[PDB]
């Protein structure tokens, strides 16, 4: 739906070399407002967006406290887990966590989610009815049972349906300029002869927000998921994204190829053709 | 805003 607040935790064990690395990140839609890194000077929750800097010192102190609380939970979790799966003390292992809420175009609660992985694998996810867990294996049933006793989901339902939305709403208001804007992709096309009898047509989308886009090639109006090269979307740095999609054509036959571009910033999709 | 609940597996 129209708006989403997510939080991303990674903890990485380093056995020979001290306490696990912990990195927390918060996101409103495709925008990063806060960051904690255990290997960084300040040892504080730091801003990364203009519309969060205005928040008072009660905000930062809180977050710093709670985020250190989170890293301390994760530090235990790497112990318990290594044990559950009986892994040696020798190896690095990764815990990843992701929670937050989506709201819809009226900014009422759409949906909650709270997902946990170990070593890049689904371990335990809270189900969309926000009452029950999905356990990926029988290490993870142990945990589920543990969290069923400790009535965990009940206390997550409180935050996801309440505080999560109510501060999502807040971050949208205080960042109206940035968070509610849509940047249409600026489109052009380039040519590069490749082979004596071949060119490449690279169709470009630049400076778009949010990050959801679709670029397709047609030959004579018939779609070509064939013969094409599509780079995964990527941040400009400046809070906008870029994408390109290339097909390689038989030279003299460029005019036949059209690249088509969808984004919510476009009412009617744009068709672009090679045109010196 | 972050949770107040530390979820040890």
């Amino acid at each position: 739906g129209s708006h989403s607040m997510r939080y991303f935790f990674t903890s990485v064990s380093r056995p020979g070399r001290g306490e696990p690395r912990f990195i927390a990140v918060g996101y409103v839609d495709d925008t990063q407002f806060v960051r904690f890194d255990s290997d960084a000077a300040s040892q504080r929750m730091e801003p990364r967006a203009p519309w969060i800097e205005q928040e008072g010192p009660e905000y930062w102190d809180g977050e710093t406290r709670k985020v250190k609380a989170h890293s301390q939970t994760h530090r235990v979790d790497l112990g318990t887990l290594r044990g559950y799966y009986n892994q040696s003390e020798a190896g690095s292992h990764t815990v990843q966590r992701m929670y937050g809420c989506d709201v819809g175009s009226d900014w009422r609660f759409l949906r909650g989610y709270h997902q946990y992985a170990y070593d890049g694998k689904d371990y335990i996810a809270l189900k969309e009815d926000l009452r029950s867990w999905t356990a990926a294996d029988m290490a993870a049933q142990t945990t589920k049972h543990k969290w069923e006793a400790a009535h965990v989901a009940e206390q997550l339902r409180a935050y996801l349906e309440g505080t999560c939305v109510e501060w999502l709403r807040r971050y949208l208001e205080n960042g109206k300029e940035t968070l509610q804007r849509t940047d249409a992709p600026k489109t052009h096309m380039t040519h590069h002869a490749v082979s004596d009898h071949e060119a490449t047509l690279r169709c470009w989308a630049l400076s778009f927000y949010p990050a959801e886009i679709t670029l397709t090639w047609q030959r004579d109006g018939e779609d070509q998921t064939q013969d094409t090269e599509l780079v995964e979307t990527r941040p400009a740095g400046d809070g906008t994204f870029q994408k390109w999609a290339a097909v390689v054509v038989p030279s003299g036959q460029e005019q036949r190829y059209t690249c088509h571009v969808q984004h919510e910033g476009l009412p009617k999709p744009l068709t672009l053709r090679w045109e010196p | 805003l972050l949770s107040x609940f530390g979820t040890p597996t």
Partner: protein
Amino acid sequence: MIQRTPKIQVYSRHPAENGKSNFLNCYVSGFHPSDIEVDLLKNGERIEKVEHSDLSFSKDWSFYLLYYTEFTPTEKDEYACRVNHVTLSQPKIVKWDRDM
């Protein structure tokens, strides 16, 4: 436990004009686990004034990271990006092409 190779991209923030100050980006994504070496080379030699966004990951739990360092493109300066990962025999070096 998993292992994805990182998919790298080297690209300027804005369309490159020789003589005009710009940003060189090294985007490594889709990778696991997180420990990764990444530098930005000028004609082979390491650029030290580099900055990185905070580790995060995507719908499939694969990590992503942006390394960037202000620079001014020219006709002859050759910018690249060296990434090493535990999924790599040898570090990858990916040259920047201003139309990729």
